[PDB]
Amino acid sequence: MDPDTFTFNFNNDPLVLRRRQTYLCYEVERLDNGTWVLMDQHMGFLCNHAELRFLDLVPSLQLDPAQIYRVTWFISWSPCFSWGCAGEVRAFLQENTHVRLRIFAARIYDYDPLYKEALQMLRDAGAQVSIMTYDEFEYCWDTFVYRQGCPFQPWDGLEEHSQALSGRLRAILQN
Amino acid sequence: MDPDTFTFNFNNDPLVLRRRQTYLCYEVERLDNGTWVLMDQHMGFLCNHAELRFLDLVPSLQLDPAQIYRVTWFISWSPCFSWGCAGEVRAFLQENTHVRLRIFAARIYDYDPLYKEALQMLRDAGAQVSIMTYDEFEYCWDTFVYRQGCPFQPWDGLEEHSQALSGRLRAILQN
Amino acid sequence: HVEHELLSKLIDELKVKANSDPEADVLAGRLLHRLKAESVTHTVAEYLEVFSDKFYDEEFFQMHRDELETRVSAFAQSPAYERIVSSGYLSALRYYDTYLYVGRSGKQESVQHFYMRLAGFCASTTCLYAGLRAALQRARPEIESDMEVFDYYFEHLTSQTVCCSTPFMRFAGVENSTLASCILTTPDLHLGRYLFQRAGVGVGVTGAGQVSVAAYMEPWHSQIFKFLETGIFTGLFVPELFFKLFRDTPWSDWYLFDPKDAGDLERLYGEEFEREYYRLVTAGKFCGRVSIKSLMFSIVNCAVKAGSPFILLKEACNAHFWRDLQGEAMNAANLCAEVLQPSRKSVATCNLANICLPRCLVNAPLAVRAQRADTQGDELLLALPRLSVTLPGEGAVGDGFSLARLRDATQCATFVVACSILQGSPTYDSRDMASMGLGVQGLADVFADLGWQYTDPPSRSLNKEIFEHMYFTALCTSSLIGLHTRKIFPGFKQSKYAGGWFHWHDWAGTDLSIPREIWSRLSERIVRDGLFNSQFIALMPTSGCAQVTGCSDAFYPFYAGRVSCLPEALRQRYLRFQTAFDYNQEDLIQMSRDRAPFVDQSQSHSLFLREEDAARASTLANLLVRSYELGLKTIMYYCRIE
Amino acid sequence: HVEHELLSKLIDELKVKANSDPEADVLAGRLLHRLKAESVTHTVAEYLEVFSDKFYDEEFFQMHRDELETRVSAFAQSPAYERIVSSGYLSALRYYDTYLYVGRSGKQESVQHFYMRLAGFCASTTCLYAGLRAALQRARPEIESDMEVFDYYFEHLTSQTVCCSTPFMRFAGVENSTLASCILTTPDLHLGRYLFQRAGVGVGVTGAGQVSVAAYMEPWHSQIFKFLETGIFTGLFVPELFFKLFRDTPWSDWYLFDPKDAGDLERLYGEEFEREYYRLVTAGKFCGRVSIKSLMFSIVNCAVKAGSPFILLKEACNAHFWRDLQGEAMNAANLCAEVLQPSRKSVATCNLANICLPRCLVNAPLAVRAQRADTQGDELLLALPRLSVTLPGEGAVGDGFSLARLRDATQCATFVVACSILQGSPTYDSRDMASMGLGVQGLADVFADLGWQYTDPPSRSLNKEIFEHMYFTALCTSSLIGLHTRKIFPGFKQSKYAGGWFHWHDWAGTDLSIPREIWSRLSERIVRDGLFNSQFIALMPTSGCAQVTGCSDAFYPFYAGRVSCLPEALRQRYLRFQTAFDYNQEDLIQMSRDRAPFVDQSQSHSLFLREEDAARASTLANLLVRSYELGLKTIMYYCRIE
Ligand SMILES: [Zn+2]
Ligand SMILES: [Zn+2]
């Protein structure tokens, strides 16, 4: 991914909620022995509902049923419900029991009126959902962003907005 | 009278109908032998409803019931009805049978909706009503107007308007 | 004073570009009104002081100074005044050049004081006639005081629902000049006393022998060719036989006669015109032997070269008059070929007042109070339908054309014309005659604002509805005025109206928007009451009021952009702005015939031709023949060429 | 270009004399709009080209270019645009100085494109949240397409029935700045990040210890005197014990406490404040010994010298909040002392939108379509009466104050504030709180147009009706928004609204224009659905958005002629133009208390005193005490002195 768009579509400032476009940064980790192992070939990102795009790409990702895998979503927006994305994600994890999903949402897609239900069923699907903190943002910047050596420059109010979103999400899941 | 007043208030132009004010010029002629005789003392004029003003002035004009008299009205407007002027004139001529009335109207006071009825009832009262021609206007000018020697100056359309009014009046009376 | 120089310079810079900028001419009008603001009277007291020599004895103004000041001040901030000021540069220029009177001191009258003067003249006339006041109260049972009469007239005039004639708006209460705009006479050659006036004159010169004035002559005249080609206009009271012989057997040979004997062709008309004409030609009394084809082509060529000749069908002009006119027939019209009265015996005049039909739209704001559509008080107008259901198109700014405020406008126009006749007629015969011409203006604007072409079937239906309704309202109001004033026009008895007749009886295929039972009640009330006016509806080009009101010129389509010479993309969306030349002329003639039965007088029917068929000199002849076959009165007023 | 120099010179020559000429400032506004005509965008395509950097990815404008162009072109010729242009020189100057955004190329946005931007931002937010669209469709069952949403917002904004806040009008869709005009915080001295913004800040500095910003402090503070006398405003959350002890036994002695210990006086209020205050004074923890008479006179003097100190009754502010707040009590308001939220835990904001009540008059023209009073589609607003029967006076320009279009304006303002909250909140906590302040403007204009004084009993009845109805409409609309978005403010449960409460329950002698049966239905629907907003009604001085509309400043009487210093002849006819100082301040305070039960937040109540009783420094004290006796929240915002 080129820069100047990771910062734009991964900023969690509520004043930046004006423009929407899902970007799902994905990576797969294999449970070798007892430690997850990352490989460079399966590292990548998607653009815009990116969730399904990834659900369609995961059959053709050299999946091995014998070895259980775990995939982490560094998605810009939280998965939505009325468009059905939470439904397909739950269905995919309902039958494919050898894959664990990690979701790191930079923002909560509250644009969908059913976002709380989407997050609740994602939690019920065995996939834990969280909100990106500074370390996830810098990991995304130095992993999926073509930085060409430039360090990660935080935006204003990253910590406060991240904490607020994390509190909202943890209040949603506890119900 | 005076110039610029007789001319203004005796013009029969329909375009001059905007300004209305009744001016009555009167003269009394006694029937001596077989010819009416005029005297200077009863010569005069009135101002503004001049018809009644004259009806109340006549008893105090040295009237002699033994001799039959005749009075001529050189009135600017034809006698009106809804204000009762025609009725008052008829009542005066109903009981005072020794006085004959001659009415010479410069214009027909058609502002009253019952002007036709007024003229008809005046005719029924025994007083003949006509419309002033040029001779009547010049007689008024050189009799009741302080002309100080200035000759009579006719206005435009005197003959035509006088003929039209006379035609209207003779159409009304014949009914 | 530095503001005046800036105002004048910006007036110049805005009016130079006002033709292509619709936001600049409005600003030019506003700034021209602002420039003359201190040069015009600001208060009613100042107006009466400056013009004291015209209003020292005017009782109405003197006793209603304060109420007039209050109403004029309210009008100044009223939206009607804003609309009047924002009517463009031409409207303000006409106001400050012609309509606004200028006193001895040099202080002109303001627009508000001008409309005050008009309404006050009307109200004073109604008050001092005592029969017009009764008629108005019967026709408007909410007017009690004379100040309410002024309110009625002021609301109808300031809103410009009723537009008076130019002589009326110029000399209502300030001068003793004649308020009749149209004068027509047929002397036995008197006429000189009217040439010195400032009113249109129409002279019938058929008996000649061997300001703007219109001369009318019948085609059978021996000097017809010398009259055709020569300030003064031209008129042709064309008989039926001319068009009959031109339509079939064009080789038939027309005959010319001199007025020395002339038989009785000038006097009479109709089928016995054919018998008298043919008796004369069999008697060998014809001076001329010209082919009818040559005469028709000469008339067409003279019309296309210049709009001088006026073609009026003698049969439709005379057979639809409220008298018989069979024994004696008129051969002359007014200046605009839209007034039809006999004029041999005496000089005939006509007082005109136009109605901006765009003000009859429901969405158009009006200075007339909302509590006036109700409490009509005329039993024959309360039962009539309103909103004129015609299903306006998708691109319609207007929302129905109420058609009830049209009747209120017609009522007020009838009363205004009655006041003008009573207080401004030049002769008692004309004053008794009480000829009223009620025209329309903005009809094309109405059709455009309702999202229709001029030719659309909804437009034709609305046209017929408008003219029938306004003729009915004029008849009812004139009957009420005659009943409450005892002033019936002299020939009402033993006439057509006295027996039951409405000038639409003598037409074929006439559809009535009135259920024909209310027409019967109108006939009964006319028979038992009479009519104050002898003529009611007459279509005036009203080229003067269109500039000050913005209403389109009379009933014509738009003719005064390049809608045709515009790309097809911007052609269907602006199709309703088609010029009058774009529309098929046969359709315009058909619409004129459709509105003809409800126009007792004639119309100012002008044909619009381009320089592709007018030069052919045969399409115009066919148009004239078709207008004849439909029985129009004025077959062609102006042959407009673009 | 010689036109622009003439335009500017005429602008100067007309604005120099625009103070005493009501016809010149309108002309000045028109000429200023004409001068900037070529410097602003003329077409929607040009607007999107000039501001492409703010609209290249705005889906609504890009996919509705043509419909937006059609509607904007219709608006340009619409009477609403003429009214906006003719709003005076100040309106146009404010437009071209602040509201109209300027791009890189220097081409400013036109007024039509400005209102397009506002309505498009609102419509895009509604269509983009998919819950605001559903709520609007449920509340307006005539809107199907997103372009109809734009139509709704555009008619309600161009007609100026909804007068949005300055930050909303300035940065809706063109900047990512905060759209919340009012911000209030109570830090534990964060605040610096909001001082760099362009919104008012209200800071509670009671805990200090021993753009425009308003500092609030309780009178028992140790440095209350140092805080009273010193860019920054002053606030006093006065406890009820102060007014009690000053009213009777003025010789009693007030006590000051430093915030080092201060007991729990700052945290709590009410009767237990008296117990805690007296426990503290019995425990000998008081640092101050100042007499209460001296402190009250010092506050009054500092208020009359300058409007710096704001007096707010702690009891009325806290005990009428939708939460208990007995344990922890807020002590800080916004900049204008009209927003009341707790702010210790997090920064609290408020989004404001005004309703010009003159637009609620029946005769006032509106860009809102006529076919919108019907098909309202909310079961709790169809049953409410309209036309607000209150017998308008004889000299009334208005004809009833419909009171139904007031509810429509309240609905649209609620939806606009919802959009602003959702798309312009600076923090998620403020976004979830959804604090809405719906003020009014032109109330004095409404009273004058209905021919009453501000004090007249019809004026008081209409005032109570207006505020009750707008609070009811705000509650119903917020409940619908919360139901159809499922974004209920966090503390709705275990709160007052969740059990049945409407902020007029806790007042004495309140008369409702609603039959108490529709209030019960509103309570039931709120309980079973929730409320999107936590605060609904808050009366803003709205000194900025009123200038471009001409509405009178907020709910105050006229205070910005010399009607009092005018002859008695021209005094009774213009008595309704009395300034706010002319009216008895007791009547104004009583009317404020009458409208208080239906204003859930505070209201910027300002006292208007002349330099004959303000210098006495005892009349203001009595006014404050009797405002206490009536339970007002904001006892005094500004002590205006003339
Ligand atoms: Zn999705
Ligand atoms: Zn009399």
Side-chain angles (χ1 to χ4, degrees), chain D residues 322-631:
Chain D
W322 52 259
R323 208 200 312 168
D324 216 21
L325 286 187
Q326 187 64 257
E328 85 280 9
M330 64 182 179
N331 59 4
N334 68 323
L335 180 67
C336 302
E338 53 89 21
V339 173
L340 306 179
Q341 325 174 32
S343 53
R344 307 189 189 277
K345 294 181 176 67
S346 58
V347 174
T349 69
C350 194
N351 303 72
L352 311 173
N354 297 271
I355 303 174
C356 182
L357 301 175
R359 311 303 289 168
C360 305
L361 302 177
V362 288
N363 53 8
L366 295 186
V368 192
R369 295 303 299 180
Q371 67 277 16
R372 293 182 184 271
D374 291 331
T375 67
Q376 189 274 330
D378 208 329
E379 79 286 342
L380 292 195
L381 298 184
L382 294 194
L384 299 194
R386 59 183 61 179
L387 280 73
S388 170
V389 292
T390 178
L391 197 60
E394 48 177 358
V397 182
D399 303 317
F401 194 88
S402 175
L403 203 75
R405 48 174 66 177
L406 166 62
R407 296 192 293 274
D408 293 331
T410 308
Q411 265 201 15
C412 187
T414 309
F415 277 106
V416 160
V417 174
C419 298
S420 170
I421 289 166
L422 292 172
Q423 288 289 274
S425 301
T427 55
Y428 290 110
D429 299 329
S430 300
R431 188 163 168 275
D432 270 308
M433 210 67 234
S435 179
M436 170 174 77
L438 287 187
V440 298
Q441 65 182 359
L443 183 61
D445 287 359
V446 173
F447 292 151
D449 274 30
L450 295 184
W452 315 321
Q453 315 294 136
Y454 199 96
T455 285
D456 289 350
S459 86
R460 298 154 173 255
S461 296
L462 176 59
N463 176 89
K464 299 192 290 185
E465 272 176 352
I466 286 169
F467 286 104
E468 174 183 19
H469 273 252
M470 65 180 289
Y471 180 51
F472 182 94
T473 307
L475 283 157
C476 188
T477 310
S478 180
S479 178
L480 202 47
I481 292 182
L483 176 60
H484 281 71
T485 53
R486 292 182 182 178
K487 308 186 76 58
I488 311 289
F489 70 94
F492 172 76
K493 298 293 183 182
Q494 72 265 352
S495 83
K496 291 175 179 170
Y497 286 111
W501 183 83
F502 284 120
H503 187 280
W504 57 257
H505 289 43
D506 289 350
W507 299 87
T510 57
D511 290 327
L512 309 168
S513 310
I514 316 293
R516 181 66 61 84
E517 287 281 350
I518 317 186
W519 278 108
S520 301
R521 286 157 61 183
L522 182 61
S523 178
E524 289 276 4
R525 77 172 300 182
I526 284 181
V527 165
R528 75 167 175 82
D529 291 331
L531 289 169
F532 168 70
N533 302 114
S534 56
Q535 294 176 332
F536 313 96
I537 305 303
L539 304 190
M540 200 50 183
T542 179
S543 180
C545 184
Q547 292 172 44
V548 298
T549 66
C551 315
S552 85
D553 185 74
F555 62 99
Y556 314 120
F558 310 100
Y559 65 92
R562 73 278 191 191
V563 176
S564 172
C565 192
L566 208 58
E568 206 276 337
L570 308 185
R571 189 183 180 272
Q572 296 290 339
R573 68 168 72 258
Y574 292 165
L575 194 71
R576 61 179 190 263
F577 285 52
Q578 268 182 339
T579 51
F581 313 91
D582 300 327
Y583 295 106
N584 187 23
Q585 290 307 320
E586 189 276 331
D587 287 331
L588 295 183
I589 298 172
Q590 185 58 40
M591 293 186 64
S592 185
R593 187 263 181 274
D594 281 348
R595 71 173 73 97
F598 315 104
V599 183
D600 49 324
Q601 297 182 265
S602 194
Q603 58 189 358
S604 66
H605 174 48
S606 175
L607 290 183
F608 304 87
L609 291 86
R610 292 182 292 112
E611 272 285 344
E612 302 295 336
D613 56 355
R616 183 177 292 171
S618 175
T619 77
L620 192 64
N622 277 340
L623 289 182
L624 298 202
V625 172
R626 296 180 66 252
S627 307
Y628 156 60
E629 293 179 353
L630 302 178

Side-chain angles (χ1 to χ4, degrees), chain D residues 154-337:
Chain D
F154 196 74
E155 313 176 1
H156 261 286
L157 287 175
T158 52
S159 58
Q160 287 167 336
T161 64
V162 175
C163 283
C164 296
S165 56
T166 300
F168 185 90
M169 293 177 70
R170 284 184 58 184
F171 318 111
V174 286
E175 278 173 28
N176 305 313
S177 71
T178 302
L179 299 182
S181 62
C182 286
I183 293 177
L184 72 165
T185 182
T186 311
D188 49 354
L189 74 165
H190 181 75
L191 177 57
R193 78 178 68 93
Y194 295 103
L195 260 60
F196 293 155
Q197 306 286 346
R198 56 210 85 161
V201 183
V203 186
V205 293
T206 312
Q210 183 179 5
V211 289
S212 299
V213 180
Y216 290 77
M217 185 180 288
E218 307 205 17
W220 51 259
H221 205 290
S222 179
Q223 317 165 357
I224 180 55
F225 279 104
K226 182 175 174 66
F227 179 71
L228 278 178
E229 57 261 15
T230 307
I232 183 167
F233 293 99
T234 300
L236 270 297
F237 264 63
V238 187
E240 59 87 20
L241 185 58
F242 191 78
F243 295 117
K244 277 186 55 184
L245 273 164
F246 178 74
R247 176 180 57 199
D248 52 358
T249 73
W251 61 90
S252 179
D253 197 16
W254 188 248
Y255 296 86
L256 307 181
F257 304 90
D258 62 357
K260 291 295 185 300
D261 43 15
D264 279 19
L265 298 176
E266 179 176 4
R267 200 190 70 189
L268 59 85
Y269 67 78
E271 191 275 332
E272 65 182 2
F273 185 91
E274 175 180 9
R275 187 272 304 277
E276 184 76 10
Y277 188 94
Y278 276 180
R279 184 195 65 87
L280 283 186
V281 303
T282 316
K285 298 293 183 182
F286 47 91
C287 173
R289 186 66 179 171
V290 58
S291 178
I292 190 166
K293 184 177 176 68
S294 44
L295 181 52
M296 180 72 198
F297 280 156
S298 178
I299 291 183
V300 167
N301 179 38
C302 291
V304 298
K305 299 289 95 176
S308 185
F310 302 159
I311 298 294
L312 287 85
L313 181 56
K314 199 173 186 186
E315 303 298 327
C317 292
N318 293 269
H320 292 148
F321 199 67
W322 52 259
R323 208 200 312 168
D324 216 21
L325 286 187
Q326 187 64 257
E328 85 280 9
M330 64 182 179
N331 59 4
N334 68 323
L335 180 67
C336 302

Side-chain angles (χ1 to χ4, degrees), chain B residues 8 11-20 83 106-116 156 160-162 164-165 168, chain C residues 54 57-59 121 128-131 173-174 176-178 193-194 422-429 431-432 484-487:
Chain B
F8 180 78
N11 188 359
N12 45 12
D13 190 354
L15 298 174
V16 185
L17 291 174
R18 303 178 52 247
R19 280 79 185 92
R20 74 282 190 190
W83 293 266
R107 293 177 299 266
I108 297 182
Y109 191 79
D110 58 350
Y111 291 135
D112 189 277
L114 290 154
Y115 66 86
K116 293 187 286 184
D156 189 358
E160 183 178 1
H161 298 150
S162 178
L165 291 175
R168 288 211 302 173
Chain C
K54 308 303 184 53
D57 62 358
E58 184 63 33
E59 182 65 26
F121 167 85
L128 61 84
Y129 270 94
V174 286
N176 296 327
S177 78
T178 299
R193 77 178 68 91
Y194 296 106
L422 291 179
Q423 286 288 276
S425 301
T427 49
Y428 291 109
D429 302 335
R431 187 164 169 274
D432 291 331
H484 281 77
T485 51
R486 282 74 178 271
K487 304 187 80 61

Side-chain angles (χ1 to χ4, degrees), chain A residues 22 49-52 78-81 83-86 109:
Chain A
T22 296
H49 275 227
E51 296 89 302
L52 271 290
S78 179
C80 48
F81 187 91
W83 279 249
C85 293
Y109 193 85

Side-chain angles (χ1 to χ4, degrees), chain B residues 49 51 80 85:
Chain B
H49 275 226
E51 301 84 312
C80 63
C85 280

